Amino acid sequence: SVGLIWAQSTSGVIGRDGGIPWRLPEDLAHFKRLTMGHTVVMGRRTWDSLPAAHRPLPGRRNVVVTRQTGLVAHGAQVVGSLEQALSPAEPDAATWVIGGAQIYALALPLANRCEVTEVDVDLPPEDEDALAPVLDQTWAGTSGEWLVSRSGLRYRMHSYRRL
Numbered sequence: 001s002v003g004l005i006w007a008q009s010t011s012g013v014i015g016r017d018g019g020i021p022w023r024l025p026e027d028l029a030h031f032k033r034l035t036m037g038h039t040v041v042m043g044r045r046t047w048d049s050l051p052a053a054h055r056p057l058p059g060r061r062n063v064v065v066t067r068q069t070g071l072v073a074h075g076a077q078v079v080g081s082l083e084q085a086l087s088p089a090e091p092d093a094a095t096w097v098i099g100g101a102q103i104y105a106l107a108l109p110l111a112n113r114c115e116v117t118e119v120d121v122d123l124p125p126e127d128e129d130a131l132a133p134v135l136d137q138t139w140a141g142t143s144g145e146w147l148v149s150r151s152g153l154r155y156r157m158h159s160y161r162r163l
């Protein structure tokens, strides 16, 4: 099982300026609950975007997809392709692809599940933004109710499974 997990604004922005242009603690908790104890696969930009307190992501096997020989920032296992990231895999569990846009595009054809957090923040896309992948007719989804964060932002979760 290969799952994509991401958070996006309603407009479909996932990234800006090498980071994420909102703060939503409830989504961080959701992300940790779904990924704890599992392998997480990310693109190298996302690895370099992690604040030092969160790099590597604790309690997870951190796999970084890069074309470079290796990385200056410690704690990752580097691989040269998504296929190398995904095999061998943890039994009875999902391997989670955790971004960013380039790595989501690589993984989308291989994925069985998507776990999306939608954040109701008004973020018209800007020219260098990373955008969420668009899902096609091979996905069936369900959506949770709108929730209110302690910061006042509304958010909700969507879950998709391959037909």
Ligand SMILES: NC(=O)c1ccc[n+]([C@@H]2O[C@H](COP(=O)([O-])OP(=O)(O)OC[C@H]3O[C@@H](n4cnc5c(N)ncnc54)[C@H](OP(=O)(O)O)[C@@H]3O)[C@@H](O)[C@H]2O)c1
Pocket: 005, 006, 007, 008, 013, 014, 015, 016, 017, 018, 019, 020, 042, 043, 044, 045, 046, 047, 049, 065, 066, 067, 068, 080, 081, 082, 098, 099, 100, 101, 102, 103, 104, 106, 130
């Ligand atoms: N909202 C969310 O859920 C979420 C989640 C994660 C990230 N983000 C955001 O997304 C943005 C980063 O996304 P991004 O698309 O710019 O970068 P990315 O997908 O994180 O990383 C891109 C890098 O991955 C490597 N790569 C890409 N394709 C490859 C291939 N075919 N083979 C081997 N290596 C490959 C390259 O690393 P090298 O250059 O080292 O070769 C490339 O520069 C940031 O703003 C981050 O904060 C948002």
Ligand SMILES: COc1ccc(-c2nc(N)nc(N)c2OCCCOc2ccccc2CCC(=O)O)cc1
Pocket: 005, 006, 007, 020, 024, 027, 028, 030, 031, 032, 046, 049, 050, 051, 054, 057, 058, 097, 098, 099, 116, 117
């Ligand atoms: C607080 O910033 C968050 C940024 C992104 C999400 C997030 N949310 C969903 N739903 N899917 C994702 N792929 C996703 O990005 C995961 C990779 C980036 O992770 C970062 C970045 C900065 C600080 C901390 C962490 C995780 C720390 C940990 O997990 O210990 C969550 C919170």
